[PDB]
Amino acid sequence: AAAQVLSSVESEIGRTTDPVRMYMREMGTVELLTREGEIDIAKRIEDGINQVQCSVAEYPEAIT
DNA sequence: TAAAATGTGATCTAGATCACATTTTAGGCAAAAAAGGCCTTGACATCCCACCTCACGTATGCTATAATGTGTGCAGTCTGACGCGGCG
């Protein structure tokens, strides 16, 4: 529920031209996910990669 | 009338005469040969060119304890008029 902070704030942002406030306020939305979300991001990544390795394994001339 | 000009005439004195042989020497006409003008040759000297050429310099890659929302040193507020967007 951080996009709705951006919502009303931008509704009431005092004509703030500086992109620093913009970007820094935008990263405030996403939080710090840790300790296995790291490991789970890794798991999903290596899974999809090993399945593009299925995708090479399925192609015959890959060995050629 | 002072002072310069004018006759004595015999005894001389440096150059001209005068026909012909021999030099010379032009001057100017033909030219031999030498020294520029033309080219060549050998020998040198210095390269331009470029063709390479290794050392030093340079473009790029990872480093696994862990660490996770700026600010930050400034401005000193000039001011009167005119547009324009809210602001009722």
Curated annotation (Swiss-Prot):
It is found in: Cytoplasm. Sigma factors are initiation factors that promote the attachment of RNA polymerase to specific initiation sites and are then released. This sigma factor is the primary sigma factor during exponential growth. Preferentially transcribes genes associated with fast growth, such as ribosomal operons, other protein-synthesis related genes, rRNA- and tRNA-encoding genes and prfB. Belongs to the sigma-70 factor family. RpoD/SigA subfamily. Contains 4 domains, connected by flexible linkers. In the active conformation, the domains are in an extended conformation, each making extensive interactions with the RNA polymerase catalytic core. In the autoinhibited state, sigma-70 factor domain-1 packs closely together with sigma-70 factor domains-2 and -4, contrary to the extended conformation that is seen when the protein is part of the RNA polymerase holoenzyme. Interacts transiently with the RNA polymerase catalytic core formed by RpoA, RpoB, RpoC and RpoZ (2 alpha, 1 beta, 1 beta' and 1 omega subunit) to form the RNA polymerase holoenzyme that can initiate transcription. Identified in a complex containing RpoD, the RNA polymerase subunits RpoA, RpoB and RpoZ, CRP and DNA. Interacts with Rsd; this prevents interaction with the RNA polymerase catalytic core and with promoter DNA, and as a consequence, promotes transcription from promoters that require alternative sigma factors. This is RNA polymerase sigma factor RpoD. The gene is rpoD. The chain holds residues 79 to 142 of 613 of the full protein.
